[PDB]
Design a protein around this nucleic acid. Structure first.
Lengths: 103, 56, 142, 117, 110
RNA sequence: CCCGGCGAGGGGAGUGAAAAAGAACCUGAAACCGUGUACGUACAAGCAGUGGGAGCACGCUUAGGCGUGUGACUGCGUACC
RNA sequence: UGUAACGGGGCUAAACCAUGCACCGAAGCUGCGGCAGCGACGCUUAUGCGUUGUUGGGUAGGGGAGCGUUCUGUAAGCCUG
């Protein structure tokens, strides 16, 4: 199956055995989760539903990696009325592998 | 005036083809002379037309 | 990150020609720029051109006669200081009919080296005769 | 006793000249020219952070409008007629069938006319 | 068999000697005896005396034959310069920077 | 001792842990001078850079989505204390 | 000086009036995910992570909270051929 779902206010497309990066889930590697906010589902033919979200649909996933992401640099400048102050910017990710897709 | 930047190494073009020369294609060998000689000209031991015409 | 992209390189062309009879020299060039850029046949555009050849063969058969024909100016700098040439639309179709569109369509091709790459495909003819009688340009129709 | 600056010696010139790679002439040798070129490189990476988003919309719409005008209709009338249908739209991100499938596109134009008069 | 010979503090500018170095370097390893004796300017006769001394330092080292040898590297480096003076009107002076070079040659049978 | 002009300089020979410590005599980054292999490349318009990224080498690993280098193609782009 | 009084192609609408909806349009406004402080909370600790309220241009200048150097003591130490 091929699906599309909502997680962390962001949308993600997945086929069985694919992996997706979410935002911070504190449970780390080897833990399992299940998602119900599925928008579309297909077997190579899509259900083409006349309503928001798939009834009885679920997606199964396992954590394969976790932690804090790579740092982004943020600096505030002005010329001849001088300042150059730096702001710190880091965010978190959790990488999850899909084990099943059902409806 | 002075060189504001070092040129790209190609810009020596037509000086680079003259920077060291023989200015001849390509000097000849003789049966009784060691160093090579100029076309229609005498060798470094005085040979011309295969015969010795001057002494060193 | 380096996420791979699929680049096509191979192309073959079947040759087309468009009719100018009863059309305006302004909008004919605007439609020809759109057809050379490919926005009737190919999407996005100007990127990755996979189109086909489209030319003009009867460029002298354009419209507007008896009024606003002794009109327009076509000002050009010859390369000799303030030395300038001017024409009319009448004179342009009477002695420059293949070049009057050639000097105007290049100003609406894509910017940078792609403009030259599309201009090399333009090849306009007048008097109903071309050098492509074995290629061979077939009529463009909708 | 004296501090003698050895805690930071050469380290500021290093931090810029290691970022000066591939730059033309003086920009990859002279620290004053390289520092100025690195702040300008920072300006263009700051502008990408605040301008990149625009070029995703420019991919989506260009393929929809060209394929819709090959179907006799303008993008503004197509996208309005598709919103008039309620749902079945899947957002501008998924309109890629405009360059990937003929039948899925003719069925989307039929949905963009379903609720119209 | 490989021999490396250098001549140091030589009374010529390194860049002027580097003009003849490229004319002898490479070119199917066939510029010595081919044009080296017939090349113009005071730099060519210097690098010829170094090259004929390098092959004599090969015959000093091993056997009696050197006919398998060719030149594989030929380079020149800048010697320590001498700040001299020559006066002018008033003066005022000329810089007259006196220069030297270090010439290195490699000859090999491979 | 060898070449050379009983030159100069190197190159052998002998001493030393080490003479890349040999007289200009310990150690030491650079501006200037210069290297070969890989990669790209032989008509082209602007402050000289920046985000994405084919191809190839180099690296490693089921090679299978990610490191080191270069770079086609392409969105953005009139210095500065 | 060289087109030189639509930006330019070009134009009786593509000029100009007001009228109706669509479409493109910023870091705005909203949503989603976060940051820094503080009033109030929830779940928990080699101790902080969420939830909610509320604020976040700043040179002249005033006032705070951290990072770093060298040296004497600790050093009758510790690291070390």
């Amino acid at each position: 199956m091929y699906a599309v779902f909502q997680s962390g206010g962001k949308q993600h497309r997945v086929s069985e055995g694919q992996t997706v990066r979410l935002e911070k889930l504190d449970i780390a590697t080897g833990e399992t989760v299940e998602f119900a906010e599925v928008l579309m589902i297909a077997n190579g033919e899509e259900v083409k539903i006349g309503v928001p979200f798939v009834d009885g649909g679920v997606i199964k996933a396992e954590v394969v990696a976790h932690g804090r992401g790579e740092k982004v640099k943020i600096v505030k400048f002005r010329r001849r009325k001088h300042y150059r102050k730096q702001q710190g910017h880091r965010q978190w990710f959790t990488d999850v592998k899909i084990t099943g897709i059902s409806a | 005036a002075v060189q504001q930047n070092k040129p790209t190494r190609s810009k020596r073009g037509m000086r680079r083809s003259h920077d060291a020369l023989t200015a001849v294609t390509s000097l000849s060998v003789d049966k009784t002379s060691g160093e090579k000689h100029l076309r229609h000209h005498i060798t470094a031991d005085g040979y011309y037309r295969g015969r010795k015409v001057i002494a060193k | 990150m380096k996420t791979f992209t699929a680049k096509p390189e191979t192309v073959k062309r079947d040759w087309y020609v468009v009719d100018a009879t009863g059309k305006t020299l302004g909008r004919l060039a605007t439609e020809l720029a759109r057809r050379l850029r490919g926005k009737h046949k190919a999407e996005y555009t100007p990127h990755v051109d996979t189109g086909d050849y489209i030319i003009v063969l009867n460029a002298d058969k354009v419209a507007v006669t008896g009024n606003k024909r002794t009109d327009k100016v076509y000002y050009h700098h010859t390369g000799h200081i303030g030395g300038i040439k001017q024409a009319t639309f009448e004179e342009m179709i009477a002695r420059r009919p293949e070049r009057v569109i050639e000097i105007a369509v290049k100003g609406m091709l894509p910017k940078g080296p792609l403009g030259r790459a599309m201009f090399r495909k333009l090849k306009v003819y007048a008097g109903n005769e071309h050098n492509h009688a074995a290629q061979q340009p077939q009529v463009l129709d909708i | 006793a004296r501090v003698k600056r050895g805690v930071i010696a050469r380290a500021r010139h290093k931090k810029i000249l290691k970022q000066a790679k591939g730059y033309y002439g003086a920009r990859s040798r002279v620290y004053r020219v390289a520092f100025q070129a690195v702040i300008k490189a920072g300006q263009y990476a700051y502008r990408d952070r605040r301008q990149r988003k625009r070029q995703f919309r420019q991919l989506w719409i260009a393929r929809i409008n060209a394929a819709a005008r090959q179907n006799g209709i303008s993008y503004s009338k197509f996208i309005n007629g598709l919103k008039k249908a309620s749902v079945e739209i899947d957002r501008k991100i998924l309109a890629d069938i405009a360059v990937f499938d003929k039948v899925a596109f003719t069925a989307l134009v039929e949905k963009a006319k379903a609720a119209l008069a | 068999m490989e021999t490396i010979a250098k001549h140091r503090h030589a009374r010529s500018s390194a860049q002027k000697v580097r003009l003849v170095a490229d004319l002898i370097r490479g070119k199917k390893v066939s510029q010595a005896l081919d044009i080296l004796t017939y090349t113009n300017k005071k730099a060519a006769v210097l690098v010829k005396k170094v090259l004929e001394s390098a092959i004599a330092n090969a015959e000093h080292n091993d056997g009696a034959d050197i006919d398998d040898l060719k030149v594989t590297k030929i380079f020149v480096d800048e010697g320590p310069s001498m700040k001299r003076i020559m006066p002018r009107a008033k003066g005022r002076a000329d810089r007259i920077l006196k220069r030297t070079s270090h010439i290195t040659v490699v000859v090999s049978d491979r």
